[PDB]
Ligand binder design. Structure first.
Ligand SMILES: Nc1ncnc2c1ncn2[C@@H]1O[C@H](CSCC[C@H](N)C(=O)O)[C@@H](O)[C@H]1O
Lengths: 362, 570, 100
């Protein structure tokens, strides 16, 4: 609720901007660095005192004439070096390590544009990507092997864009334009078995190529949540939040109130709707919102550059006491929003290559 | 407004409880969030993280681009040189899909849809509190005005009490279950009969009420009837009991479970006489007191018919040239058009002969072994008796639509060594499913294609274009989507059904089109299911890419497949 | 080859449809499963096969039949088989011999 736009920046490339992420995998006293991807440019910045934001290393995709769409920070346990993977219209994964100056791990095999990059909370070696081919293929980066693929034949007949790990990396919730609300359990005994051999497979040991599993059965699915294009969903602990073109915010849980997510069956079809934080003037899809590290502070952008901020305190959608911030200059189109690893600093990015930084009056 | 308020409140009793409930689970979520976030944050503390490093100038790349990131605020504009990213190839766009080899057949508006019956129960609460003013007061708000006169309707509507539910209304448990009731023979078989589909002789054939009524009869006197006193206490060992058995053509203290009596009812319909086989089938009871139980059963249940037939025809008078003449009669009637390909349908002729009213005759098709037409039906395919192998022009199978039946092409080894991959015939690979080993690689003409690892000859089997069974109307609707997306994984199976390969299929769906391709496509007809076989026009060697003609219009050809990649030599 | 008589996902696809039906008890519902699974395992087409296949099946999982207590339910399945004229008289006899 207590926030103000302290810094504002703008890329000179004037290109529409895309996903921005913050280095949550950090340490106390580490530089407060966040990253940004444009059409073919990838860049990072560090927030500083007095609203200062010094520019950091920025690379350019001078070869692939395609628009980057998603990016996410990465960690390596071997070198303790942070990394970051990116993808876009061509759907090829580039994961750059800033320390080594370049990217060495290349991932191809997906079809149309990749529209999701987001790593497992526990293993940094695991990254499941979502693209326009309806594929939930996951890559074991450290081993450079394909991992078990979800969805497929029984999955989404339409494109998928939104996917989320829960806090423990227990289950993966996902949905796309299909309006199908499907999740798959990571804790499925079969896949850890594949996961275990995935971490130690070597094609040089035996001719037998790796056998990734294919999965076509969610723990649950539904389509009664939205009659319009759902564009954002996130793991709200045991609940599931959602965003759609209809300018309505709906969190929900499967089945009835007493129905646990892990106890539920794929055959279930009941849903418990509980979210009512509706908004307006953001009818276009492809929007993406973000959450704080502690799952406390919620902020939403808008097509008209306005801010739609909420909290996860005793404040509940029973009355929806909103805090709708707005900046006069920031009004063109908010593409992506991202919290820092705190409730004080937030980075807001407009479509017109411009970046707006808001800080809390804590 | 007290009655109106209570109607508002009565609804609100559930509503604020939900408000209490959502808050209650919210705290449970929050503590779990605090549990999980703190636990995760602990490892974040442990993992040392390398701080960021700033860019440095490159002497060998002094010509790289430089971007001056503007600052919207008073902060100075900051510049940094650019770095070229990695160069990687591209794979042509495709959609996720899964293998298979058989075939397969195949918003968000409003809330709660209706006036909830919960309010009716709340109205019932307004009824149970119960002079005439009360009846009118109940009548005041609800559309079903609950006056004492209309309270009678309320009670009648309350007579429903509970829905029967989705379960077998009759007590028909598994016969292995101890609670298996004395279900009669047909009711027990009813579940299996509905689920079973003899077309593929499987239960719930998801590729095929379209089932036989099995109301037929068959000879039962094939048993040897080798009576012998082999069971100490049997149908034998008692001359009076054994002689009394001849008349049909008191048990001991032993008793029989209700489940046993059910399968006792089942067993008689199989042999009608073989009480000895009952002893070996179920070890709980000896033939005696089961033979005697059947004596009791024969006295209770009406005796079985046990009728045998021979049919007036014995032999001859059935030359296959008449069949061809019968086929000639059908051919000249409507098969002259050769455009209206109707998929096979099992015709039912319980009493009527194979008259011109036979659905296959109307569908200009031959009856099959599954048809309810008798074994003398003058439409069924005779066979594939060619001595060398059912593969060439002379053979009726290869000329006709019929892939040679496993039970009919007796000379071409159709039934023989079905497990063995190699066989004399070349018109039963689709029956066996013996494909080739196709390859996937980005086709040079356009996007993906299908390659072959080995040489293959002309006029021989290639992998079958399997897919999904779908009707024309949905095919155009889905095709309209694919037509918008230029995709054409649709195939004109027959005039009555279409097969589509976008979502579900096998590898060969990526085969590209050519106007003079080395490989062709011909619909075949096998085992009652039309399919489309693929065969190479000419001799092929290792590594050649596969092509086949789509048979589209020339306008559609340039609309879709306008690339051919071959000029004239002179 | 990346392909066989029966791709995996179909198996999980069909068994889910198996549990969809309500009027079939679980004891008589499981007998549906393993029967159809072995059929698609080998892809029989002709009458000669199923007479041999049942003997192949009964030895393949006859011990498993004991554990799941579907021996008697499977007998009714075999009874339906002869009703379909698809099985012979003595084939019923040999099944019990392998069964016990
Ligand atoms: N010879 C040809 N020239 C141009 N387009 C063709 C073609 N043969 C097939 N196509 C198109 O390809 C579509 C099938 S999808 C296969 C396309 C391509 N092989 C790829 O993998 O990307 C059809 O809709 C058809 O319109």
């Amino acid at each position: 609720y207590s926030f103000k736009c302290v810094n504002s920046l703008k890329e000179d490339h004037n290109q529409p901007l895309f996903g921005v992420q913050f280095n949550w995998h950090s340490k106390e006293g580490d530089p407060l660095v966040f990253a940004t991807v444009g059409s073919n440019r990838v860049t990072l910045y560090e927030c500083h005192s007095q609203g200062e934001i010094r520019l950091l290393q920025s690379y350019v995709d001078a070869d692939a004439d395609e628009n980057f769409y998603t990016c996410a920070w990465t960690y390596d346990s071997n070198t303790s070096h942070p990394l970051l993977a990116v993808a876009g219209s061509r759907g090829i994964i580039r994961i750059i390590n800033p320390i080594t100056m370049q990217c060495i791990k290349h991932y191809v095999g997906h079809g149309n544009a990749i529209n999701e990059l987001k790593f497992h909370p526990r293993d940094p070696n695991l990254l499941l990507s979502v693209s326009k081919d309806h594929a939930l293929r996951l890559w074991n980066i450290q081993t450079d092997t394909l991992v078990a693929i979800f969805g497929g034949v029984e999955g989404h007949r339409d494109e998928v864009l939104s996917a989320d790990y829960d806090l423990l990396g227990e289950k993966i919730m996902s949905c796309g334009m299909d309006h199908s609300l499907k999740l798959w359990r990571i804790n499925s005994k079969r896949m850890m078995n594949a996961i275990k051999e995935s971490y130690d497979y070597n094609p040089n040991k035996t001719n037998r190529p790796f056998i990734s599993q294919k999965i076509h059965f969610p723990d649950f699915s539904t389509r009664d949540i939205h009659r319009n294009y759902v564009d954002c969903v996130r793991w709200l602990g045991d609940l599931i939040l959602s965003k759609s073109c209809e300018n309505a915010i709906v969190c929900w849980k499967p089945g009835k109130m007493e129905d646990d997510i892990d106890k539920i069956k794929p055959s279930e079809s009941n849903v418990t709707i509980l979210g009512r934080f509706d908004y307006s003037q953001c009818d276009i899809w492809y929007m993406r919102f973000s959450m704080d590290f502690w799952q406390k502070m919620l902020a939403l952008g808008n097509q008209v550059g306005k801010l739609y901020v909420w909290d996860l305190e005793v404040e509940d959608p029973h009355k929806a006491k909103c805090t709708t911030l707005t900046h006069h200059k920031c009004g063109a189109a908010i593409r992506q929003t991202s919290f820092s690893r705190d409730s004080s600093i937030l980075i807001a990015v407009c479509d017109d290559a411009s970046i707006w930084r808001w800080d809390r009056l804590r | 407004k007290r009655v109106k308020s209570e109607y508002m409140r009565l609804r609100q009793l559930k509503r604020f409880r939900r408000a209490d409930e959502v808050k209650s689970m919210f705290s449970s979520n929050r503590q779990k969030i605090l549990e999980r976030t703190e636990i995760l944050n602990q490892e974040w503390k442990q993992r040392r993280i390398q701080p960021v490093h700033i860019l440095t100038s490159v002497s060998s790349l002094r010509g790289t681009r430089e971007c001056s990131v503007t600052s919207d605020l008073d902060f100075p504009t900051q510049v940094i040189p650019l770095k070229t990213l990695n160069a990687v190839a591209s794979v042509p766009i495709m959609y996720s899909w899964s293998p298979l080899q058989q075939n397969f057949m195949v918003h968000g508006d409003r809330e709660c849809g209706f006036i909830n019956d919960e309010i009716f129960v709340e109205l019932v609460n307004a009824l149970g509190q119960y002079s005439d003013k009360i009846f009118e007061a109940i009548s005041s708000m609800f559309p079903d005005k609950g006056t004492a006169e209309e309270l009678k309707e309320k009670y009648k509507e309350l007579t429903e009490q509970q829905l029967p539910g989705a379960l077998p209304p009759e007590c028909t448990p598994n016969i292995d279950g101890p609670n298996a009731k004395s279900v009669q023979r047909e009711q027990s078989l009813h579940s299996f009969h509905t689920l079973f589909c003899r077309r593929c002789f499987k239960y719930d054939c998801f590729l095929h009420f379209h089932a036989t009524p099995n109301t037929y009869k068959r000879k039962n006197t094939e048993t040897a009837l080798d009576n012998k006193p082999c069971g100490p206490q049997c149908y034998q060992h008692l001359e009076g009991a054994k002689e009394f058995a001849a008349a049909l053509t008191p048990p001991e203290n032993v008793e029989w479970s209700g489940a046993e009596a059910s399968m006792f009812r089942v067993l008689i319909g199989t042999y009608y006489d073989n009480f000895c086989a009952i002893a070996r089938l179920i070890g709980t009871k000896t033939c005696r007191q089961v033979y005697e139980f059947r004596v009791k059963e024969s006295s209770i249940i009406a005796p079985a018919p046990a009728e045998d037939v021979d049919t007036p025809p014995r032999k001859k008078k059935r030359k296959h040239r008449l069949w061809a003449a019968h086929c000639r009669k059908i051919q000249l009637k409507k098969d002259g058009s050769s455009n209206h390909v109707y998929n096979y349908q099992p015709c039912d002729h319980p009493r009527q002969p194979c008259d011109s009213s036979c659905p296959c005759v109307i569908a200009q098709n031959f009856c099959e072994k599954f048809c309810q037409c008798s074994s003398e039906c003058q439409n069924r395919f005779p066979g594939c008796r060619c001595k060398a192998q059912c593969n060439t022009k002379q053979c009726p199978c290869y000329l006709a639509v019929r892939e040679c039946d496993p039970d009919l092409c007796l000379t071409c080894g159709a039934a023989d060594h079905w497990d063995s991959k190699n066989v004399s015939c070349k018109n039963c690979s689709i029956q066996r499913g013996s494909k080739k080993h196709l390859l996937l690689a980005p086709s040079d003409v356009a996007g993906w294609g299908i390659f072959i690892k080995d040489p293959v000859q002309k006029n021989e089997f290639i992998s079958e274009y399997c897919g999904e069974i779908i009707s024309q109307d949905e095919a155009d609707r889905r095709g309209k989507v694919y037509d918008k997306y230029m995709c054409s994984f649709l195939f004109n199976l027959n005039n009555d059904f279409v097969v589509d390969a976008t979502r579900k299929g096998n590898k060969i769906r990526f085969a590209n089109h050519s106007v003079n391709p080395n490989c062709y496509a011909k619909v075949m007809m096998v085992n009652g299911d039309h399919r489309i076989g693929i065969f190479a026009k000419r001799a092929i060697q290792t590594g050649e890419e596969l092509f086949f003609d789509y048979r589209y219009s020339q306008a559609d050809a340039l609309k879709y497949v306008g690339i051919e990649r071959e000029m004239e030599i002179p | 080859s990346e392909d066989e008589k029966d791709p995996e996902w179909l198996r999980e696809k069909t068994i889910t449809q198996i549990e969809e039906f309500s009027d079939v008890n679980e004891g008589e519902k499981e007998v549906m499963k393993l029967w159809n699974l072995h059929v698609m395992k080998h892809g029989f087409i002709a009458d000669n096969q199923m007479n041999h296949a049942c003997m192949l099946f009964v030895e393949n999982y006859g011990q498993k039949i004991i554990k799941k207590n579907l021996c008697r339910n499977f007998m009714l399945h075999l009874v339906s088989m002869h009703d379909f004229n698809l099985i012979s008289i003595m084939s019923i006899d040999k099944a019990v011999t392998k069964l016990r």
